Amino acid sequence: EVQLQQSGAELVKPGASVKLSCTSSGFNNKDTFFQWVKQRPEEGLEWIGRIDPANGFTKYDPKFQGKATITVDTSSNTAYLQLNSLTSEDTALYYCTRWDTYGAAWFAYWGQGTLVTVSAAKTTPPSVYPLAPGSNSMVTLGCLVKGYFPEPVTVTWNSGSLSSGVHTFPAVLQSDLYTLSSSVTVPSSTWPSETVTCNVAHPASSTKVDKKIVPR
Amino acid sequence: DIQMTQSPASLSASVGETVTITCRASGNIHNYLSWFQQKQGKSPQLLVYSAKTLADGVPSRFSGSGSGTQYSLKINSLQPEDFGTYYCQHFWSSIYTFGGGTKLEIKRADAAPTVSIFPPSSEQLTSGGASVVCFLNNFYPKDINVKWKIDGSERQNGVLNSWTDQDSKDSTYSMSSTLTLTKDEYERHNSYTCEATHKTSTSPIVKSFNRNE
Numbered sequence: 279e280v281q282l283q284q285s286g287a288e289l290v291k292p293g294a295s296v297k298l299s300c301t302s303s304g305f306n307n308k309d310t311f312f313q314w315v316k317q318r319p320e321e322g323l324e325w326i327g328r329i330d331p332a333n334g335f336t337k338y339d340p341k342f343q344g345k346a347t348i349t350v351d352t353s354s355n356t357a358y359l360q361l362n363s364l365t366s367e368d369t370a371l372y373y374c375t376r377w378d379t380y381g382a383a384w385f386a387y388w389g390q391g392t393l394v395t396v397s398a399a400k401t402t403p404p405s406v407y408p409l410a411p412g413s414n415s416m417v418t419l420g421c422l423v424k425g426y427f428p429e430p431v432t433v434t435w436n437s438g439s440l441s442s443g444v445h446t447f448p449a450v451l452q453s454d455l456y457t458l459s460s461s462v463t464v465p466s467s468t469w470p471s472e473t474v475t476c477n478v479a480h481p482a483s484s485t486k487v488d489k490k491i492v493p494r
Numbered sequence: 495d496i497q498m499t500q501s502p503a504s505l506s507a508s509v510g511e512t513v514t515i516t517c518r519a520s521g522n523i524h525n526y527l528s529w530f531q532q533k534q535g536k537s538p539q540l541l542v543y544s545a546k547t548l549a550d551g552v553p554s555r556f557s558g559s560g561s562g563t564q565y566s567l568k569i570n571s572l573q574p575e576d577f578g579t580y581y582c583q584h585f586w587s588s589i590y591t592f593g594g595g596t597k598l599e600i601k602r603a604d605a606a607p608t609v610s611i612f613p614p615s616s617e618q619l620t621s622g623g624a625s626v627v628c629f630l631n632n633f634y635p636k637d638i639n640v641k642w643k644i645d646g647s648e649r650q651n652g653v654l655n656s657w658t659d660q661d662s663k664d665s666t667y668s669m670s671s672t673l674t675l676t677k678d679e680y681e682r683h684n685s686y687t688c689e690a691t692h693k694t695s696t697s698p699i700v701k702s703f704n705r706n707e
């Protein structure tokens with residue numbers, strides 16, 4: 279199989295620098311370029327630059343000339359993206375994409391992404407509260423995830439068992455802290471007769487929370 | 495440095511309809527153009543390369559066309575899995591600039607929100623906070639207003655609203671509203687109403703609870 283393996287999310291202070299990585303495996307063509315792309319939430323894809331692994335030559339968009347530095351290790355088939363003098367403007371998701379050739383056909387593979395958050399604000403674990411209703415066939419239950427920084431958290435229900443009927447909303451920032459909600463809709467014969475649970479992870483603060491939806 | 499003017503910015507079509515997206519280049523790019531599909535919270539997927547060549551495992555209802563500066567993407571039998579943002583990219587010069595994107599909505603029948611209101615959890619109360627949460631789920635179209643009535647009077651501030659992107663299963667939207675109070679402001683009132691306005695219903699949908707069940 280052919281695939282691009284990126285590094286994990288980054289949190290960094292303004293003025294600092296960071297070095298993401300992007301590893302490849304099983305590419306038929308060794309000459310194809312590693313490319314890097316920037317995406318802000320609800321904004322367009324934005325080409326940063328590329329590198330030629332045969333020789334280490336790079337090209338950048340003028341907006342990123344000096345900001346981004348793309349390096350490679352053809353020895354290990356991994357490519358890195360260093361960003362310097364970071365500001366909030368650099369906060370975004372960063373993809374590494376690379377093409378491949380087999381016969382006379384082309385293929386475009388993309389990495390999973392690597393989030394980068396630039397801010398002076400302190401890491402803060404989330405407070406997770408259950409939302410059970412007071413006094414219909416399906417019943418909606420809720421989960422409130424409040425007071426955390428930075429993004430992201432991950433919300434599941436019954437350890438991911440309850441996969442359908444879920445609505446998890448975008449976080450909203452206010453006063454250096456995110457607040458987020460998730461809803462789940464399940465049959466009335468399911469709850470409160472059985473245990474329904476809210477699972478939250480906030481990797482930045484190494485927090486893992488389970489919140490049971492106890493009635494009333 | 496060639497520019498990519500993509501059009502339209504947004505689009506909305508029902509399943510089975512035929513749609514046409516366009517990228518204009520500021521100079522000639524000799525068919526060196528790719529179209530990509532990006533699904534929410536996922537990486538972009540290639541569709542067409544070299545202007546008209548379908549990428550691996552891409553259905554034939556997709557086809558690209560054009561030449562020189564003017565390029566366009568066509569979708570004939572629009573299927574559920576086609577929702578998302580479509581980009582174009584060129585590889586003619588050394589700077590592979592993307593178009594701005596064309597976001598594609600799935601058009602569906604009107605649906606009123608299912609409204610649900612929840613009082614603060616005891617745990618949050620006991621720490622001094624009090625958030626009232628209201629979900630407005632699975633409605634269409636996207637356009638919607640929610641307001642909070644506390645003991646009959648409209649409340650402005652404390653409200654934080656959030657909206658999901660179009661659902662991949664039923665093509666609806668859903669919205670969340672959070673009114674945060676202090677515990678002791680919360681206990682100074684009894685009736686809390688989440689009131690929703692939407693084109694499906696001329697009279698607004700109302701969900702309430704009394705602080706004393």
Ligand SMILES: NC(=O)[C@@H](N)CCCCNC(=O)CCCC[C@@H]1SC[C@@H]2NC(=O)N[C@@H]21
Binds near residue numbers: 307310384525526
């Ligand atoms: N060893 C070889 O094949 C060399 N002659 C070529 C080296 C290739 C290095 N360049 C890249 O990876 C950048 C990929 C550009 C996208 C390609 S250009 C043709 C095709 N049509 C598209 O719309 N996109 C792809």
